[PDB]
Amino acid sequence: SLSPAEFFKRNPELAGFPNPARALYQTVRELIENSLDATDVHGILPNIKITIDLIDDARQIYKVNVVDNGIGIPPQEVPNAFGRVLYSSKYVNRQTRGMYGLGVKAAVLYSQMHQDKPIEIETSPVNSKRIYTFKLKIDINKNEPIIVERGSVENTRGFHGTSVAISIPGDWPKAKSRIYEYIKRTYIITPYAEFIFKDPEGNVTYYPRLTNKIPKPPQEVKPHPYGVDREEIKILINNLKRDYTIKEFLVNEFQSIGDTTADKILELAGLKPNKKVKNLTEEEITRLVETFKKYEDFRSPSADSLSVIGEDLIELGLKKIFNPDFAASITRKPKAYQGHPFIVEAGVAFGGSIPVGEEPIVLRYANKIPLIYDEKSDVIWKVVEELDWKRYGIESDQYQMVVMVHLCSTKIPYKSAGKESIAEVEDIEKEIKNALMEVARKLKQYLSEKRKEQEAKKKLLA
């Protein structure tokens, strides 16, 4: 079957690149998302600049440049990072930003497919004495890096971070409103970041830092047994540096297998505790996986691999951007499904400067990135539409409200490749509704108190 790189070339509309307008929007996303995971995950307040230039008017080629102050990239890792598409998606053991498996490499591939300039990289790891520079292409036939230029320059006191520029076919007039909306919505749940955006018309927007409070980062965990299939077991075995016995393999390579549990799993699966794991047959792997799926006594997938926005930042962002009369939020306790942890957070903003409409403004997030297209098909949209807001104190048919929901997990379920809608998985839908109801009860209280005070002034004051 086809490699991911070859599947993308044939089916770019399934990977976020159906046309030049979406190509331009998706490239901006990939760059900003890499810069955020290079900063806040490592304790650094993100300082990020985004520029888009029209470089060829008739052919509509645009150059996209994103600069950050993150941890940088060891020079020997650069060529593969941007110029070699992996043969598969690796098992997720830590929460990260992004929907697409190819990541920034899809923008690089699209660039080399349709025009002639190389991508431009400048990077400096923490404490580096040099900034390392590169001009690079991916070989569209071979799936390997081509180093066009490679250099370095003396660094300055305290500097670290990365600059990436990519030249692509685009369509700014079509993409414009959705690119502005992408950046706005990122800023709402990232009030500790600072952004500068210069667009192709020369317009500049400044999005200032509002706080220095950064949420606890996600941590790497070992895989949970309910999450691994036969091929993933094989990958884990082949990766071992040491000659583990099956027993040693169970306790050291997985979540929720202590000494006693391992003994039980081994008996149930008809396996020898002291047999070397590199010698496990195909039949023996099948029994292991079937034992995993049947075993009823594992701890829930650990939430150590996840990272929340937090009630305090959600509320701060909603207040500063919308200037509402009221705002409230909830970060729920962790759940789990199919061997992976998940958490839902929700928020509402009401009144004030928010526009009068007949429906709420709905904001959707997944592992800290906004979802922009395909909103009417999303489970979050369904849950919000189905709630009866009259039960929660909203009285007119016309009102001023923003609602947001964030889902985080090491396995986000999407409906269709190339659409930005979260699937209607029962366990997740139920928890999103529980969360929205928790926040809506806080609104019901606000509104009941407000109406009491208005009635009191009307009836008791001269």
Ligand X SMILES: Nc1ncnc2c1ncn2[C@@H]1O[C@H](COP(=O)(O)OP(=O)(O)O)[C@@H](O)[C@H]1O
* CA–CA distance, 292 with 276 (Å, rounded to integer): 19
Q: Is 68 within any annotated ligand binding site?
A: yes
> Taking CB within 5 to 8 Å according to partner kind, which of Mg ion, ligand X, none is near residue 253?
none
Closest contact distance (angstroms) between CB of 34 and Mg ion is 4
Shortest-Cβ-distance residue relative to Mg ion: 103
Beta bridge partner(s), residue 401: 350
Give the residue closest to ligand X by C-beta: 103
CA distance 245 to 263: 12
70 counts as binding Mg ion under rule CB under 5 A = no
Q: From the list ligand X, Mg ion, none, which binds 38 (C-beta under 5 to 8 Å, kind-based)? A: ligand X
Decide: is 16 part of the binding site for Mg ion (CB under 5 A).
Answer: no
Mode of pairing for the β-strands spanning 194-198 and 47-56: parallel
- Tokens 């490699």 locate to 3
Complex with ligand X: residue 79 or 360, whichever CB lies closer: 79
For the bound state, the minimum distance from the C-beta of residue 141 to ligand X, rounded and expressed in Å, comes to: 19
Query: Residue 103 interacts with Mg ion (CB under 5 A)?
Result: yes
CB-based contacts of 358: which residues, under 8 Å, 6+ apart? 397, 398
Instruction: Show me where the chain is broken: residue before each gap, C-N > 2.5 A.
Output: none
**What are the beta bridge partners of residue 370?**
365
HEC readout, 188-242: HHCCCCEEEEECCCCCEEEECCCCCCCCCCCCCCCCCHHHCCHHHHHHHHHHCCC
Residues that bind ligand X (CB under 6 A): 30, 34-35, 38, 68, 70-73, 81, 98, 103-105, 162
- How many residues belong to the site for Mg ion (CB under 5 A)? 3
Closest distance between ligand X and the C-beta of residue 98, in Å? 5
Nearer to Mg ion by C-beta: 98 or 200?
A: 98
Q: What does the alpha-carbon distance between residue 239 and residue 319 come to, in Å, rounded to a whole number?
A: 48
Q: Interface mask (CB under 5 A) for Mg ion, residues 22-61, using x and -? A: ------------x---------------------------
- Burial call 185-217: b when 16+ CB within 10 Å, e when fewer: bbbbbbbbbbbebebbeeeeeebeebeeebbee
The least distance separating ligand X from the CB of residue 312, rounded to whole angstroms, comes to 27
Q: Binding site annotation covers 99? A: yes
For the bound state, the minimum distance from the C-beta of residue 77 to ligand X, rounded and expressed in Å, comes to 7
Q: Considering the complex, what minimum distance in angstroms separates the CB of residue 46 from Mg ion?
A: 15
Pick out the residues of the known binding site for ATP.
34, 68, 88-90, 99-105, 419
Binding site residues, Mg ion, CB under 5 A:
34, 98, 103
